[PDB]
Amino acid sequence: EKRSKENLPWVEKYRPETLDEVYGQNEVITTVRKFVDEGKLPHLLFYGPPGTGKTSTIVALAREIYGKNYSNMVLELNASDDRGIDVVRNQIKDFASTRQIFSKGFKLIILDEADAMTNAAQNALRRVIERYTKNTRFCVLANYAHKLTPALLSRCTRFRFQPLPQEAIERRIANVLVHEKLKLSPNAEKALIELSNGDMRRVLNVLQSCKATLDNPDEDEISDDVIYECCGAPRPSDLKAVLKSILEDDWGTAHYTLNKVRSAKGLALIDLIEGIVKILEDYELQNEETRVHLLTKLADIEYSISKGGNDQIQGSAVIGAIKASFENET
Amino acid sequence: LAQQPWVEKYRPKNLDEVTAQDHAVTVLKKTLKSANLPHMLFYGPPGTGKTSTILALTKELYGPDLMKSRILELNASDERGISIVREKVKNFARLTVSKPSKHDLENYPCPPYKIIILDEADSMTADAQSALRRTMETYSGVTRFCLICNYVTRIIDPLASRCSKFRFKALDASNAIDRLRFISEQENVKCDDGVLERILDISAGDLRRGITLLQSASKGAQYLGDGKNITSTQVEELAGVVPHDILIEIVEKVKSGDFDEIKKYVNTFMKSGWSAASVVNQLHEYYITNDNFDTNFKNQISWLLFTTDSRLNNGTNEHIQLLNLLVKISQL
Amino acid sequence: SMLEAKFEEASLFKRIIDGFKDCVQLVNFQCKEDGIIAQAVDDSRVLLVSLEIGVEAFQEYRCDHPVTLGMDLTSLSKILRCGNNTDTLTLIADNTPDSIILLFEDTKKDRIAEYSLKLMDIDADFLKIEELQYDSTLSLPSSEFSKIVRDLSQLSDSINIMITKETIKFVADGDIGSGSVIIKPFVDMEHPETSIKLEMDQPVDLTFGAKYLLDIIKGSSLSDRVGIRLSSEAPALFQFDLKSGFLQFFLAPKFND
Amino acid sequence: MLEAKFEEASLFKRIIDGFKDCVQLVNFQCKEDGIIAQAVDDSRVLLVSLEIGVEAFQEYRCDHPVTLGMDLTSLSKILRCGNNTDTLTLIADNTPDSIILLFEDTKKDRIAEYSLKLMDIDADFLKIEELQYDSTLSLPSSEFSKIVRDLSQLSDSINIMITKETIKFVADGDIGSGSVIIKPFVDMEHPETSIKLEMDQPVDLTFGAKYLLDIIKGSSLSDRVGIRLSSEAPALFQFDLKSGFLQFFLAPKFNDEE
Amino acid sequence: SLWVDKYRPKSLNALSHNEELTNFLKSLSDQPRDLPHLLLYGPNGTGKKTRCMALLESIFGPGVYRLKIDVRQFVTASNRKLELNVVSSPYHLEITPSDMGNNDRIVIQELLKEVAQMEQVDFQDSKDGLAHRYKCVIINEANSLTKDAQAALRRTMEKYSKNIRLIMVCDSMSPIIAPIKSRCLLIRCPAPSDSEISTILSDVVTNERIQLETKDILKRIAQASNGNLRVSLLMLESMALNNELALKSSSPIIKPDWIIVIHKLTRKIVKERSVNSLIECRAVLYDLLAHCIPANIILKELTFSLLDVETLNTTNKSSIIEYSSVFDERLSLGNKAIFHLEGFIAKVMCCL
Amino acid sequence: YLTKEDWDSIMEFFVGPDVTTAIIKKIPATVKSGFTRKYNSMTHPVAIYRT
DNA sequence: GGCCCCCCCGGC
DNA sequence: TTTCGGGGGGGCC
Numbered sequence A: 001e002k003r004s005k006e007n008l009p010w011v012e013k014y015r016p017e018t019l020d021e022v023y024g025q026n027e028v029i030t031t032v033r034k035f036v037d038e039g040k041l042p043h044l045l046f047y048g049p050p051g052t053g054k055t056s057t058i059v060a061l062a063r064e065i066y067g068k069n070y071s072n073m074v075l076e077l078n079a080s081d082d083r084g085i086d087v088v089r090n091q092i093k094d095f096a097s098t099r100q101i102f103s104k105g106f107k108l109i110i111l112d113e114a115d116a117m118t119n120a121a122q123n124a125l126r127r128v129i130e131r132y133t134k135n136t137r138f139c140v141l142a143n144y145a146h147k148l149t150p151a152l153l154s155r156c157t158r159f160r161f162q163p164l165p166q167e168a169i170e171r172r173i174a175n176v177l178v179h180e181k182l183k184l185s186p187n188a189e190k191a192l193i194e195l196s197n198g199d200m201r202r203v204l205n206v207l208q209s210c211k212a213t214l215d216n217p218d219e220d221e222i223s224d225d226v227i228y229e230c231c232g233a234p235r236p237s238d239l240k241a242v243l244k245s246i247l248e249d250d251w252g253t254a255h256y257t258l259n260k261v262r263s264a265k266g267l268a269l270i271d272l273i274e275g276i277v278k279i280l281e282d283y284e285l286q287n288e289e290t291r292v293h294l295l296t297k298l299a300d301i302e303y304s305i306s307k308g309g310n311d312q313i314q315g316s317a318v319i320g321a322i323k324a325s326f327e328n329e330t
Numbered sequence B: 001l002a003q004q005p006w007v008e009k010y011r012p013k014n015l016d017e018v019t020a021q022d023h024a025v026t027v028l029k030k031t032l033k034s035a036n037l038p039h040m041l042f043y044g045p046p047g048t049g050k051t052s053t054i055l056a057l058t059k060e061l062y063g064p065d066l067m068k069s070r071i072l073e074l075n076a077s078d079e080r081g082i083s084i085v086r087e088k089v090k091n092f093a094r095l096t097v098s099k100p101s102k103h104d105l106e107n108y109p110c111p112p113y114k115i116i117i118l119d120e121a122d123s124m125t126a127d128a129q130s131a132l133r134r135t136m137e138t139y140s141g142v143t144r145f146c147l148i149c150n151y152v153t154r155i156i157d158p159l160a161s162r163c164s165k166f167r168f169k170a171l172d173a174s175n176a177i178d179r180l181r182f183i184s185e186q187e188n189v190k191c192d193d194g195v196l197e198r199i200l201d202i203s204a205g206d207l208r209r210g211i212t213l214l215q216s217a218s219k220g221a222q223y224l225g226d227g228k229n230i231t232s233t234q235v236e237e238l239a240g241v242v243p244h245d246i247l248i249e250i251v252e253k254v255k256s257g258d259f260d261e262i263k264k265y266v267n268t269f270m271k272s273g274w275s276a277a278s279v280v281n282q283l284h285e286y287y288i289t290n291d292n293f294d295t296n297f298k299n300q301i302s303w304l305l306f307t308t309d310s311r312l313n314n315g316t317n318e319h320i321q322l323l324n325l326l327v328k329i330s331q332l
Numbered sequence C: 001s002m003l004e005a006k007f008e009e010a011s012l013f014k015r016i017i018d019g020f021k022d023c024v025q026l027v028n029f030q031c032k033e034d035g036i037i038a039q040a041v042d043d044s045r046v047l048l049v050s051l052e053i054g055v056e057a058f059q060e061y062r063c064d065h066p067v068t069l070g071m072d073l074t075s076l077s078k079i080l081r082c083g084n085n086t087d088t089l090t091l092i093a094d095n096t097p098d099s100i101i102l103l104f105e106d107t108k109k110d111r112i113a114e115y116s117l118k119l120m121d122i123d124a125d126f127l128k129i130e131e132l133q134y135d136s137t138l139s140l141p142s143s144e145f146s147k148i149v150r151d152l153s154q155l156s157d158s159i160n161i162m163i164t165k166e167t168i169k170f171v172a173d174g175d176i177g178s179g180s181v182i183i184k185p186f187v188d189m190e191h192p193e194t195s196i197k198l199e200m201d202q203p204v205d206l207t208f209g210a211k212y213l214l215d216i217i218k219g220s221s222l223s224d225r226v227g228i229r230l231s232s233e234a235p236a237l238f239q240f241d242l243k244s245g246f247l248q249f250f251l252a253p254k255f256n257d
Numbered sequence D: 001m002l003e004a005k006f007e008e009a010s011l012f013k014r015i016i017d018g019f020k021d022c023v024q025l026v027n028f029q030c031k032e033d034g035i036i037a038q039a040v041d042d043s044r045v046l047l048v049s050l051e052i053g054v055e056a057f058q059e060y061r062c063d064h065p066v067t068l069g070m071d072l073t074s075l076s077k078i079l080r081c082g083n084n085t086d087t088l089t090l091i092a093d094n095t096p097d098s099i100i101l102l103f104e105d106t107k108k109d110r111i112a113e114y115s116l117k118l119m120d121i122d123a124d125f126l127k128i129e130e131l132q133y134d135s136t137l138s139l140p141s142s143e144f145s146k147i148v149r150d151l152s153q154l155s156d157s158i159n160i161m162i163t164k165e166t167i168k169f170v171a172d173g174d175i176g177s178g179s180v181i182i183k184p185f186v187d188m189e190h191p192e193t194s195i196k197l198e199m200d201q202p203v204d205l206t207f208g209a210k211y212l213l214d215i216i217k218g219s220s221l222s223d224r225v226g227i228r229l230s231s232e233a234p235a236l237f238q239f240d241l242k243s244g245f246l247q248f249f250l251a252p253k254f255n256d257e258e
Numbered sequence E: 001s002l003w004v005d006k007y008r009p010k011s012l013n014a015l016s017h018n019e020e021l022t023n024f025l026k027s028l029s030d031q032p033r034d035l036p037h038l039l040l041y042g043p044n045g046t047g048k049k050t051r052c053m054a055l056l057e058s059i060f061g062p063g064v065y066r067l068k069i070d071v072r073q074f075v076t077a078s079n080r081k082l083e084l085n086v087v088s089s090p091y092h093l094e095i096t097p098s099d100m101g102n103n104d105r106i107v108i109q110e111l112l113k114e115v116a117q118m119e120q121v122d123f124q125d126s127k128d129g130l131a132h133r134y135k136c137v138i139i140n141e142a143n144s145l146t147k148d149a150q151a152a153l154r155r156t157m158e159k160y161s162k163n164i165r166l167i168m169v170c171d172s173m174s175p176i177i178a179p180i181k182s183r184c185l186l187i188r189c190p191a192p193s194d195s196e197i198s199t200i201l202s203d204v205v206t207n208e209r210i211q212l213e214t215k216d217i218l219k220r221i222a223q224a225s226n227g228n229l230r231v232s233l234l235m236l237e238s239m240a241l242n243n244e245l246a247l248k249s250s251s252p253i254i255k256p257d258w259i260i261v262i263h264k265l266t267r268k269i270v271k272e273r274s275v276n277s278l279i280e281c282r283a284v285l286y287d288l289l290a291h292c293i294p295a296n297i298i299l300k301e302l303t304f305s306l307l308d309v310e311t312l313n314t315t316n317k318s319s320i321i322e323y324s325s326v327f328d329e330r331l332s333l334g335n336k337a338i339f340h341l342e343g344f345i346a347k348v349m350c351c352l
Numbered sequence F: 001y002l003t004k005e006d007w008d009s010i011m012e013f014f015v016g017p018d019v020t021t022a023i024i025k026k027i028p029a030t031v032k033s034g035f036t037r038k039y040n041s042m043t044h045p046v047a048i049y050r051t
Numbered sequence G: 001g002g003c004c005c006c007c008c009c010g011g012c
Numbered sequence H: 001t002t003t004c005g006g007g008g009g010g011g012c013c
């Protein structure tokens, strides 16, 4: 790196260093801590969605086992490094079959993002894992479990990293606010958690952008409005008004309301579609075909939007689909 | 200069020349003083000023001289396979930042990191994108990444998670009129009232298209040699907009409902070269915003127009699609 | 400049780099007022290389403050190949440098070739793994060690070294057969350069990979003798002494099982 | 009606080999004065000019100037089968669809006579009117070959900065930069390797490494190469022949940052 | 030389239809130093390439018409060798990357970038010897380019505009991606009217001295071409040759073989509706496709011939057009065209 | 700039009522021989050099 | 020993 | 047949 840690992005500045700084995965953290505290470390696998703390957890565990010099006592490989059959057959085998250079102890191999590895390399890894288990332990990290071969999964003990809970996100936000000398409104925190979707990376990025947005962060307070302008996301009031107009007004009024709401702050149609879907999924529809039509048509519109197209036609299609689907309610 | 197209000649030189992207330009300017620029993912529709914004940020960060030693720009014209990602990008990100001069440190902020700009990142394969995940995080202290794309869905979820997202809003007559008026004034283009608003409405979020249309109108006016204000009729003609007479003829033929007459009229119409996208857009505008049709008719026509537009977006024959759409509307 | 170090003959540095370029990828130099000390670890984390070129090997060596330089041996070798084998070589660096300058000068003519190699942000420590008290320390001509390694590696991919009282045994057990070479200490006053010395504390028996020994033996072109120090629970040290510095290979033995 | 009896056919071999890569179909005008040729590269970024004077040939004569569009690859194929030290001649007739290349030798047995087909290539009135080139220098061919083969590894673009009493070479790439500064050099005991320079206004021109490599492929003709640099005109690299020279007008790489 | 090529105009003043487009092109050529990238779209055979050449001749000198063909070599990642035939002039260059299918991308990354990133030697009409002008590159059949090939053009146009200007010609704009359409000045090229086609044919006849009983002949030939001027000229030449350079009131209109085959296929589909009929239709489709007849052309002509039948009702025509739209989309997204053509024919047989 | 091979290739494209295989076969042998002799007895231009 | 080239699979 | 990427196995050197 260069200069102090204050030059780093918040996603990297607040990376957990120890195992007590990881939040939202209490069960997994406790289990791994107990395993490391008694020498009962098996071949580990961490399966989870993006931005949940798998890499942070494994690096913290390696630091706990070895110490500050963990980088000189582990073999860490990821998607940026070639991991072909030759690599598995030579480099990994040599690392697993040899003693530590610096200080005594067992050998740890961290194959981060192993789901990117080919089937041949994973197959070659089988006996490598099973033969040097006396002195070596393997850790695998994955987001998609369908890419891993059945045998490799069979040889590993699985741990699932759940989407981050609300309480853990609030505690981390409190720590970040205290360190950064920031003030966050309760509704601002609510909006941040809602838009995070269980990812701490999104929380930290949005909070950094909000801090940048404030003119005088020293005594200014971050409000839900700041989040909405920073992210460009529709306000809940805007979504509610659009849905109300679509559901109990004529086509002209609905079109005018949608256009005005979108042009007030330059909102995107995709965010509106997601918001309306979230609102409608809480509705109690009398008829199932209403929900079926809503889901099918909105999914089609979302797929069409994903490839460009005409924005006005797409908005009119959204309005018409909602109206037609709700006509079935009677 | 006088030998360059207006679109390139009025490319924002600094971050203060970006017209309607303040919600992100503000934080980008703040980074000039904070020196903690995060990984950025710019996404938005065409001609919203993403490449210009990143280039201006580089201008204001490093300066004219230190730029080339601190920027690595790769676009779709460059090979960006998994091997390239794992060798060239990794090597550049692993290097120490170039030494600034005394002048650079005296004048420009010179943050302590370099920048890699993967423009048009939506054209990169999934494996190549995955190869960047740990490169972005491991060397964040010496390198920062800017992924610029048009379709955010084409970026894999881990990369979007690692990057702070910036959406560029569409440019319309309410937020981009000032820049177009400034360009016209500098270029001394005499236009009637509402001509610039009409240009921006026709552009539909693309300021590059609006500038090109203004240049074409200016060239036409100069060649005419009449010293008369440019009118909206000429702007519409240069933009390929179908005249309202042809549109009312089309809707009347559709109202008639005869298949043979509609087919003959469409056959004659297709010989003029009108784009099907413009015809569909104008038909949508005419129908959805007309009080003479009931709710059910609009409900059906909206879906028909959406289907036709989606089919046309896949490079399909325009004649067949237009005929099918018109027949289906006539049978509504 | 901050650091200015002149090699009278570029062949010296080319040979020193040639001694360990086939076993490591990225090297880290750390220059001080007492010379240039460099470290390099291999991709498998099985072999470490430590070089300690002294100030007596340069025509003139000036270094104000300690300076770190992370480099890739491939690019360094590529550029060093550019320079001729009859020209003086100046290594030049500035305060917190972004590049290292290699200046080839031919006093015969007025031709000066300057090459700037961009540095890498390699942040690591040395840890000075030089375990105090080893179990056995032997010294013998590098030619004999190279011959033994080349002969035995052709039988098996693993070589076992046993140190017993006045006995050094190299054993290989492959598929076609096995091969054992036994050498005992001896001294020749007429030609001490060929003598073999052994100082023993406890018996030793350590296995090593043949590829790593084949890589290590390439340093015999720099020194006529090699010193091998072995100790259980510690990596094996293979030292080649130079005019003013030395080159050390620390090789981790294989797990016994 | 036309012959160009050569002192050594190896000279013609090297001459043809020096620009085979740059161009393949080039019009050769044979006059009593000698051989001339000017071919624009397919990319319209490089021009190959060639001329061999009557003096170089052992015995050259011609009754009527004739333009031949013979292929370079075919002539190379014809020559490569020839011996080392012979006296190639280029005889033909009034209406030649082919040219008979007489690979004659002092001995009556070491003969490699061949025939080369002629192609109807189109020739235009190319003009190479002399210009007041700001700088012009001459340096040994071996030094240029070494410098180019060295700097091509470190980059694909080579900048030739000719300032006051400086012949600076520059090549910037991803791994690093390479510069080999040369200065006016004279050796009384061996002046053949003396660097000559004459310079009026500083010249900055950056060219492609591939083009320079291809040009130096044909530098074996002369032990010295002459570089003529003009800021507003395409710089030209010349290799002297026995009684003429081989010039290459290589356009400069476009500067977009400026 | 055929009459279609022997009387093609070579200057903007020689154009004889769509005078508004001619005036627009003259205005563009008045100050060509700041000319943006151009994209000419319109029906086939209208005269788009002729107008592009006329605009180039207006910008540069008459020398744009001295064209020469050369061969450029390319190497893929697999070492496979590829060849591209490039038409070039002292002032402009022409390329048809679609000729290499999915490999067209390489062109945009190798040839074009080579032209724009380097200056060119100009030893004519110049004093220093270096060109003081931008190079005009014409991409034909731009609508046939792959999406990645088009994406490779964006920064090339946006960075080297000071040296390279692109004039793309396409028949339809739907295949072109939005960024490329945004980066170009769009020029619509309407098809010539019947009166203009008749005037052109009359001029050709007068120049060639072809006896005509009445001028109405040229009218009918104009109507049979559906606005295609090239087809009109070729049809006039064919009829004149088949009638001993003398056209009478009873001279039939000659149609090409593939149109006759498609019409016979339509008649067979209408008459018989079964699986054996589908097998014979597959045979006919294979025969048509094996002779360089594009699948999209087959689909369009078959659909319109079916819709031009005086025995089907409105429901049948509606079903036919719907199936044609669906299977045209399928063809745009598929590789084996025979499958989609057979599916369309089967659906049409079922509906009838 | 058409050659005999190009002539045959063009003649081999037509389909339907315009198939020239039977007609071409029916052409007198002497006519084809004379056509070939005339073609090979002259010098013809080349559209592309070194195809 | 190392490039360089050609050929062949790819789900579970 | 067939658009990358990875692996094997042979051929120059």
Ligand SMILES: Nc1ncnc2c1ncn2[C@@H]1O[C@H](COP(=O)(O)OP(=O)(O)OP(O)(O)=S)[C@@H](O)[C@H]1O
Pocket (backbone or CB within 6 Å): A010, A011, A012, A013, A014, A015, A016, A021, A022, A023, A024, A025, A048, A049, A050, A051, A052, A053, A054, A055, A056, A057, A142, A143, A172, A200, A201, B158, B161
């Ligand atoms: N449980 C967590 N507690 C605190 N911070 C977290 C947590 N999870 C993620 N983060 C934050 O997000 C950043 C990235 O965390 P990561 O460990 O990279 O997540 P990840 O699951 O390994 O990412 P993937 O699956 O490879 S996309 C960290 O620097 C943390 O600042």
Ligand SMILES: Nc1ncnc2c1ncn2[C@@H]1O[C@H](COP(=O)(O)OP(=O)(O)OP(O)(O)=S)[C@@H](O)[C@H]1O
Pocket (backbone or CB within 6 Å): B006, B007, B008, B009, B010, B011, B012, B017, B018, B019, B020, B021, B044, B045, B046, B047, B048, B049, B050, B051, B052, B053, B149, B150, B179, B207, B208, B211, E154, E179, E182
């Ligand atoms: N915010 C803006 N302010 C001023 N001019 C703009 C702006 N956005 C676009 N333009 C104009 O349109 C031209 C092109 O802008 P670009 O930066 O290339 O848009 P872009 O979004 O990066 O294009 P894409 O997404 O790759 S198609 C600029 O040179 C400007 O002249």
Ligand SMILES: Nc1nc2c(ncn2[C@@H]2O[C@H](COP(=O)(O)OP(=O)(O)O)[C@@H](O)[C@H]2O)c(=O)[nH]1
Pocket (backbone or CB within 6 Å): E004, E005, E007, E008, E009, E014, E015, E016, E017, E043, E044, E045, E046, E047, E048, E049, E050, E051, E200, E229, E230
């Ligand atoms: N007399 C005359 N003939 C034209 C004109 N424009 C096009 N043509 C003729 O129409 C033929 C087809 O034109 P072309 O540009 O190749 O069609 P496109 O490329 O598909 O648009 C050409 O052979 C010309 O001879 C015109 O303006 N006047």
Ligand SMILES: [Mg+2]
Pocket (backbone or CB within 6 Å): A054, A055, A056, A112
């Ligand atoms: Mg991770």
Ligand SMILES: [Mg+2]
Pocket (backbone or CB within 6 Å): B050, B051, B119
């Ligand atoms: Mg862009």
